[model samples]
Target chain A: DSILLGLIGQGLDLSRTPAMHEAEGLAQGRATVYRRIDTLGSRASGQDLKTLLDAALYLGFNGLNITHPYKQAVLPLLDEVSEQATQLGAVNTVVIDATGHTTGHNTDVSGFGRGMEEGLPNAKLDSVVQVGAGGVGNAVAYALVTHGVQKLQVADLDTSRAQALADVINNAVGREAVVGVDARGIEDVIAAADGVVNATPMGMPAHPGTAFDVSCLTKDHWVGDVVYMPIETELLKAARALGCETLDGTRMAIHQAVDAFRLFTGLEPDVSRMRETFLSL
Target chain B: DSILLGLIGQGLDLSRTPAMHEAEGLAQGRATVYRRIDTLGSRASGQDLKTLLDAALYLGFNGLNITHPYKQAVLPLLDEVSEQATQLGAVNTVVIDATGHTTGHNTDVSGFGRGMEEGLPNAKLDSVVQVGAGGVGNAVAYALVTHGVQKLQVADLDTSRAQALADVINNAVGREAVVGVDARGIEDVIAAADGVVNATPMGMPAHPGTAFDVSCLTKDHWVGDVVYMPIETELLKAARALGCETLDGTRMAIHQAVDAFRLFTGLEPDVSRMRETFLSL
Candidate 1:
């Protein structure tokens, strides 16, 4: 397949997709090509996904991938979306035909889901409570569903905001799997639930701390937090002391990519290989 | 975010899309610069999709994607395709914005579909009996959908043969979903099915394989074949015997690239990067 791919995004300092795909081509005995177009920040002139799309079509690329703020914005421009993408309204991938027709697809859900699974394989969350309902959180919550759990609980400090995501999942999998709770003092919920999913901005270098009272978390509960920049967060540390299964933020970065690889090449990627590549970095 | 890109086909190898895109500035962020060109030897000028497209748009290059076998072929010359090309119908892809403005979109359903997914995962079939198909098989098969399970078999084996596949597939995927078996003879399907993808020729290192022998294949197959040289059939020994994944012979060698990457940045692409990028045999 001689398909060509172009990428547009930022914070993507580790531009490795080109090589990753090139390697895939070698492994499959196919002849295809790919390249990245980091379109982040001020030179912001052609940094938008729409601009990238126009370029790809004009130059004859089969498709392109978008990143960051543009994910949700990309929806209005595309011809269609996947059920998950529709729920999230954010796109990380796009498919452009030679006809210049463009459609958007999202893989972040599976990408992050598998990431969480990799981080805590043996942990089971009878109930999970998340904080944010934005793109990243959307991806994380969807991933949580694959786990054989009976209940998942969520609480965005914003109330209805959390309910919006719950509605999306309910419509997608056809069940009210998420329940929103007040997170102001989640100590009680933390004590009762089997797992805790922190899909908020806390724990990043800029925003630190656990969404709930991490100190009160019980030993039987598993903590899956999304604060990776600093790697180790207070929530993760507390969960460890309680002997609870804890997943780090970097795992999400790796897992969120699982679906993208398959979407582009239809080959189930070697996550361990991806991990090795990540760790080597 | 915003970025710019430049594009060109292979023959216009002289085009410079990458440097221009890079020079455009990433002050907003790093600009992704790239290029494309087609060059496997079949067109009126020995140029491929890569050449024509790259040449047409590689000009100011903010973003430009073109169609082939001259999507505007007739229009450019006498004003349109012959009654035959007309009967085949429609041009490849086009490049124009929202208003009622229009160009052409020719990657076609047949060429691209077969070229991209023909042998990829989730694609399975033996002996493809393509009917009333035409256009560049490159874009055709790359985007093709394969669900049947017999030796990749295609029979437009009728004398008229499949037309340029790109434009065809550009139109086909949405309609037929790219699956069918219009041929006859159990033995014929069997012989053609074994991962029946071989777009080259029919005999030696130079001749490629033949489209006949319907008996050598079975259901567990794949088919998307093209005769690359003296016929696209000049290169199919390994793909045929293994019965792994089959796409016509020419798909690999003739995938002409236009300045797809540069389209994003409105700059020129570094054809050198792409040309040097492929695994040299």
Candidate 2:
């Protein structure tokens, strides 16, 4: 029997996972069903991710993608964690097999890395300014370090928490490459940065402010945003006006999601179709 | 995405349930799946079916059918029980809803009753002599009482256990309609008994012996044996030789299985096709 897949998470209200797999299924003449089990307990239990995973396993769900608060919580439950996710201490996707075993993957790391690798092939990320220090931010920064980006700088609304995570990354990637910056009074750090990465929640739904102003960005700089809900973040827009090569959140999101889908179903996801679907959303 | 069904129980070898359900699915033009889980704990640590149930609920099985030792153990997990099964103090099927709620059903009682009503509608059972007083025996005797059998005289190799079950039936039917008889000597009871019911393991693969002198059976005395492996039990063959109508264990087994299928899927199982499949075995 063609096994059925179940999903339970947020940002899945209009997910393209179904369309992406359906395309693959149509090509192969074998159908793959993906059922969504939307959970409303993330705010309630502080265990929504675990509940989703548990419910998925409970309902014979083959696997699921874990998002938000759960990415870190899911780390301990996985049978295997990619070196990237293990080092980052975060996960964005989980795959379960016929035996009910789970494995976690940090596709965000792969997703961000792939875009940065191909888009900024020759650009130096030696001394970069990164924002957020959260899930997506951590994944991108970690991937950058793995790609040999020394002197990595991190900025966040919560300076202490950002500093702590920066310290952890510093210890892992070497103190020379990882540095924490307090954005409370550090607009000058943004002007001097080579690679500016936005991992902060400021550009998302609630916080509509751009990660940084265009005046602080330079033509020599390369900018990227991890928030994909809106492909065009103000930071990217500013970098674009500054003639800086800018990367949209959609690039990282799709790349990471595709990497995650491969880990999930053992099939290559349609990258072009995934990008089109993301743009449509 | 079609929701998949999951099952979780200790030592469940549901290799049989799947074939039965998959056949039913083929007939209905719908696809269905059943997953088995063997979660039995070691005897050293004090085994508990509750642990297995908890895991099942967390894992997301739509419904589950428990066998053997777990039949009665899952009582505390169910919201309600069927009247007949409530008296029998056992459950063989459990249904879980989208909300992770569970309800238990006694398919053994329903199945046995259905088999008796449909397979041997005219088989005289007024003065019944039943062998064995265990799970199926209790269910069958209760069914017989419900069918208005005048007196259900129970006998077992262990006379006290039979007597204890006779008391249980007496308490269940709200009247004393059962009496215990020594199985070693069932000739006198068989002479006057309109039907002889064998619920014991005497004629099964493990226990090979005719519970009574079935040769003494007459055209007026019908016989029922709950040993499906050797569909024509020695007791049944001897009774048939004496011109007695017979009900083999296969009918009860098939009927029990169908009842469980309905409990799980809420669909009418193809009894004829199921019977053909059962015959092939």
Candidate 3:
């Protein structure tokens, strides 16, 4: 049987998700189709995320991979959700059962964990400043603290949302390891921190800008940015030029897909092979 | 890419549709998955067809092949229906677009026509008595009239429903080719007619009975039964034992799936190969 899946997000025309999942499915001796349900284009053409989701289900999809804005919007629509997904207040994967009950899951946190473990092994995590407090940001913060970050300062354009995320993370881990800060404080925080994380959409092609000024970075501070399209993001480029340890978005992207792949199809995908495939793409 | 599809009906646990389509898709160098949406079992478990359909569309299915009671029920939910499907007043296939608009199509007419041309090539069709005026009966009646049946008599448990179908047929062809008769007259009609068609659920395992008495049949008349689960239905068995020409439901079943495959995947499927696969199953 072929596994039917989709990616729901805005501006996903160049997403490497379908290829990564499809290639993995083929390697696993399964036929998998991954479609992009572009909410931005859909809305522009008189459609909405809900309608697109409705059409996908009516047509007989096994599950869907949600992204960006819809990840949070889709939570209320699900029949059930995983604990981590509920804690993070977002869902990146949704499985639809035979009787049409939809269960949401958050592979983002585990995926980010895998990415961190593989890409930044032994890297300092005592004090770090993460830019952005969105869906992916929530997952990244959880991974950072859970992996032994003593102090995590979160910065975002919307300080209130960032504060809320900071509170959720602090409550989740029952520690004072996270604090919310304004975007203006990011540069100062990065200058003194052991690591800086760019979890915002700034490095993406649609939003072409660096999350923070590269001048604030020191050679001692490691850098990680979760924008994989331009795999060598400006932040990663700057960090590399400064001889600081760096982890590009590729590892997270590949790991997230690997996690989602298992959620969509109950197959244990080859993680390294998926990373290799992503690199090839 | 993989094409995802489904069959919508009840009591389809033994349906060979998924295997047939998946085999054909592999043969055609494409990935295809077919799922069964069992309305009865799902409703009993606190789910409805609409919920299942909504889930399918939301998850990203290419289309669905409808069957049984839902074929007619699915009409009002579609965005568009093909001309032949509209005329036949039933839909057996549905194509869902990205915008959530589902277009309905009926391959049953063409499928049954193909089966007749291949399985009963030289059968007489001057006059025929079809037992049933339900969904499949409507398609069979259309096929028989379109294939040069000079006179067609329709019989059903509900006489008024049969009369309504006869009226629709007469109005469609602009001729006096079809008439509705009570169940009492079916035997007399089949006794004199060159062919008899059983389009009802009588031969199915769940409803184990013959639509009409096989004792009334003469060896001179050919009998066709549209119940393939038992393959050798009681009607066909009796017809075969009587040395009368007979057409089983397999040809029609395989042909309909073949046609639906094209609609679902936009790929040409091998009909004979599919038949072979179905036989193997």
Candidate 4:
């Protein structure tokens, strides 16, 4: 009933993953030990990814979560990569076996995909609009495309990056089901889209604003944002004010932990219980 | 508000040190994560002393508790060794500073010494006869000598080993305060000694008896045993039933954890609280 794991990331002193995982594991009667191994700029010769992995194994860690600059960076080092992790070209969680084999998995896709099912079950999915084609943008857009969205339009400040992500997803799905739209066309795109998703950092305190004009949202449109700290992001707030069915960042966060908890300890995690912990934190 | 450390030893899945440390730290509102990193025979090529410490530093461990088969073997590897550790010629705890420096300490001495101060405060210590002169036997004998036992006689199955330990302590104390008595002479020596100490494995369920004949004890004599699984040991039970004061192995184990807790996290551990946690386990 004891599980040991840690997050390998940079600048993560305030990550809530540990608290959520620890609480949920305790709810299921497992003592989960989670550490934030942040090698942020002051790392010595013994703090590289290989060294980190070697040390984690020697220290008896069962698994580790990779984030920030190390998600894709850790790809080549893993012994096995899940189909979803290979699809996303990144890993957010690693499962270590009794024989010391490591398998990387990206829960970000399922974490947000489940948000669609739980947060907006009856929402239309034929055409969806999403902003920001960054790391999580790739994750959210893929979730939308995989979850029955026939036509997904992705917008980003870097038009080339947005186009690149769309092509990657289209190639994987083997169709012209996904398209990259310029930030300038977001207003036009949202007006015709069935749902809107925010994958940018604009809602966070560091970048305080909405990615696009939330006023373009209609009462029938559904919305979701990836920013969890202040779930009251202007986009979600404006969407809610418009009487649009919406999803906050909590489900995405909780579901990610659910998948990670399962991978780390091979135990089922309660999503609603983890949501309670996330809200409390 | 968080502390991370672990115990590195062989065959220690049932150790109470983790429970006591975690509970005592939580009593002070600190989240103490103590892992039992047992490398008992299933170790791979990566498991070794240098790897343990190196991996601990990379994993952000605060310290580690060492036990059987590796205590003395770890002495030469430490960056610094405490006076008690040097005196005992072994290390039970290794403190890892922020800069990743490892300092070894032998808490067994002060642990049992403090036990003497706590468990039998007013008991006479001028003449104490101890059985067994192995690892912890040496620790207990040195504790008596340092705590002002003027004439401490140690007996063991191997007389030469007992005599060697006595000579080491005698040289350290600069006097013949400690002498090695034959196991055959323990009864004769205890008749004149004021207290009896059991430093052997005799009282454990595995051994199933008292180290020496308890009938030799008088009513005024005090007693102690280094076995805690059944605190009601034959030696202690007989001694207590005979109206003599006694100490159980719990105090020695608890005090060792208290000292290691302090060294690992730089916090004052509540002794009675740790004792309570130890008992509950």
Candidate 5:
């Protein structure tokens, strides 16, 4: 069988999802293709999110991976949304069935959860500080609370943005596990939390430099960042230099793609092969 | 780079073009996906050719292979048509550029021509009789005449279809090299011709049996058929039994896909690799 998948987002020229999915498909004996459909590219022509979904549905695309800015943007455009994705209030994967129906899913929650353990196996998850309440931040913050983090202080410039994400996640789990914090009080949360995670767009090429000051962080506080463009983000580098266990963004990407690939093909992909391909690319 | 390709036609579930395209792309390190979009399937749902083309263009399809009933039908839907495709009045390949412009090209003419030379290296080109004047028939007849066949008798059930194809082909060649013959006169043409080709759908799973009774052909008359689905078509089987050096329908398909792959990727494809992939599938 053949599978056609694409990533619909902006600034994805060097994203490694295509290579990871393609290699996994190859190993599983499927003719799988993964394309990076950047809205920043001329091909988009400033088309709306609905047009992309309509085009993919009409053109026989099996599924698509939504990233960055469009993770939440694509939720309302789909025919259905998975409970897990709805709970997180974010969707990173959209699977289109043979009958031309689309269902949204979020693999990032589980991906980040698994990645955190892989990179920081023995690190404490009792308390965590997440900076940013954007599309991905919703997934990452939800993942932390669901993964047994009793307290997740979500810090954002817009306090309501953080509060809304924390509200839905708590309602989904039926617990008061997360709370919104002011961006100005990020250092206060970092000082009290066992680990701090950067879920913001900062540290990427377009949004360069660390998301916030790391001088307040100590050697005992582990750090994780969800920006994979540069595996060694300034935040990760600073935390690593401070003798804190650091989880590079690459770990989250590999597991996120692994779960999404499974949903697209209904086949258990070879993680080693996918990781090899991601590293090679 | 990633390449997304599709084959748009009716009754194309078992077509080998996707395998050939995907394997070639895999060897070249491109994430190429080829999908079979059968208009007869529910996915098409009675959609017209224009709608399908619009869907592919909007969905970021790199190119598509138009086959069977839609080859000639796709000519007018393109933004540009190649001279060779215009002459043949058929387009087997469509290249969609980054700017969303589509160009139609006829690789079947060159593919059939090369296949003829490869299969019947020393077969007579002086007088060849052809059957069928449908979509692919136009290309096969054009190939026969352009490959140095001085006299071609195109016998078809629809005499006008054959006559119109001959008239335009002869006009393009600047010589009266091809003629339309009545279906009843097939035996007469076979007796006088050195080789006969079956461009009709006869001998395929749907269109069974030889296009015309092959009892009149002798060992001296070589035969070629374009129906690759049943490689050993009734026509080729009948002629081979008569001790004639015959070419099976698979030859044309292999070379046709080879040329189309070249156009789609501008990469020199390994014929042996493509052949292996075709047979394996």
Candidate 6:
């Protein structure tokens, strides 16, 4: 049997997801076809989230990887959702069962955690500062705490949103492990922390810039970014130049897909092979 | 992208379609998942054609292979039907477009034709006798006519059904190309014809009998059978023992899947590779 899957989102025509997933599926002896359903494109024009979801099901998709605006929008349409997805208020993966029942899952947190655990296993976790508190920010924040970060500082342009996510994490993890701070304080937070993580959209291809000031990065401090495209982000480059340990977003990207593959096929995917496939593209 | 597909019918729990399609898909550098939607078993109890069709769309299936009891039953449910399928009044393949529109196709005819063309290209086709006038029989009859068989004699226990099919083919082909004959005259028909084809359920595992008497065959006569489970049918063995040119049903089986694979993925499948995979099963 072959696995039919698609990535549903807008402006994702160049996404590496299809290639990464298809290659991994082949390595596992499965026949797979991963299609891109771009909402803004020619064939997908005038198609809303519901319409795309309907179309995916109608066309016989085994599973779909949700992205961007539709990730949160598709939550309500699913028959069931994982606890992490419910808590994060987002879903990046959807699995359709034999009975046409759709289940929502979030792999971003596990993927991020797995990447960090594998890439920077011995890195200090006493104190860390993370930028952004949106969908991805929430997952990263939770993952940092779950991975044993003692004191965490979250900085976002939207202070209230960051504070709200911090509060949720505090309640869930049962400690004063997280605190929300204004973006203006990001430099100070990074200067004092063991590592700084950029969870914001900054350093992405469309938004080419560093999340934090280069002056704040120190030789002993580590850096991580969630932006995968132009994988060697400017922040990581500067941090590396400063003799600071750096972790790019590729591991997170590959690990998240690895987790999603498990959810989609109930099979253990080769994390390293998936990373090789992703990087090869 | 991954290709998701299903085979919709009853008593197909042990069908080798999924393995064949998946292997070929992989060979084509496409990931594919082929599922068996057996309506007979517990997993699909009370599941009707409409329900299954709806589910295929809902579950994100690229297409479905329609089989026994439902091939004809699925025609009216399709959004469009190919000319051959419309004429055949059956569809073994259903392709769902990106817009969720379902189209029907009949590949069994081409499969049978390609099988004969490749397997017994020089076998005398001046006159041929085909036993049975059921679903497969109809397709085989049409294929023989299209393959330039000057005269076709269709023999069935239900002579009226055979006659109706002959009339349809004669009208479609615009010639005196076909005629219905009583099953009792099959021996004489085989004795006079250049080749004989077994399109009946005879020689299949469940049936376990030859469509016609083995004594009727001669060293000069060629033989073909549509039963492929054992690949070597009893009738085929007798024909081989007589040193007659023999075409087994495996070619038809493999070629039908080859054509179906093309319809499903729009990729030119490796016919020899698919045949090798099918034989390995």
Whole-model lDDT, model 4: 0.84
Candidate closest to the true structure, highest DockQ: 5
The candidate 1 chain B region of ten consecutive residues with least summed lDDT is B93-102
Q: What local distance difference test score does each model get? A: 0.52, 0.70, 0.82, 0.84, 0.85, 0.84
DockQ of each: 0.04, 0.10, 0.29, 0.31, 0.51, 0.23
Model 1 chain A: ten consecutive residues of lowest lDDT: A39-48
Candidates 3 and 5 compared: the better one by TM-score is 5
Per-model TM-score on C-alpha atoms: 0.50, 0.73, 0.89, 0.85, 0.91, 0.81
Tell me the lDDT of model 5 at A86.
83
Order the candidates by DockQ, highest first.
Answer: 5, 4, 3, 6, 2, 1
Q: Which stretches of candidate 3 lie over 4 Å from their true place?
A: A41-62, A76-80, A97-103, B43-59, B97-99
lDDT of 4 by residue, B1-281 (tens): 46677888787867999888878766776666787777763322337877777778767778899887678888888899998788778789999887677899988888999999998999988899989898588778888898989999899999998999899788767789888889986888898889989988898888899888888998899999888988889899999988998988998999999998998888899888998988887
lDDT of 2 by residue, A215-244 (tens): 878899888887766667777777888789
Interface Cα RMSD in Å, per prediction: 10.5, 6.8, 4.9, 2.8, 2.1, 5.3
Q: Can you write out model 6's per-residue Cα lDDT over A1-281, one digit (the tens) per residue?
A: 46778888877777778887788777887766777777665445556777677555544467899988787889999999998788767889999876656899888889889988887888999999999887478888988999979999999888998899899888868888899998995798789899999998888888999877889988999899888888888988999999888888898788888998888888889888888888888
Top model number, TM-score:
5
TM-score of chain B of 3: 0.91
Write model 4 residue lDDT over A17-104, tens digit each, in one string.
Answer: 9888878766786566687778872322337887787667656678898888788889898999998788678889998776666899
Worst 10 residues of 6 chain B by lDDT: B38-47
Q: How does model 3 score on DockQ? A: 0.29
Alpha-carbon error at A174 in model 5, in Å? Answer: 2.5
What would the per-residue lDDT of candidate 1 be over residues A164-244, giving only the tens digit for each residue? 777777676778787767767777776777888777877776776666677768888888777766667888888889888
The residue pairs that clash in candidate 2, if any, are A57-B59, A58-B59, A58-B60, A58-B61, A59-B59, A59-B60, A111-A256, A151-A177, A152-A177
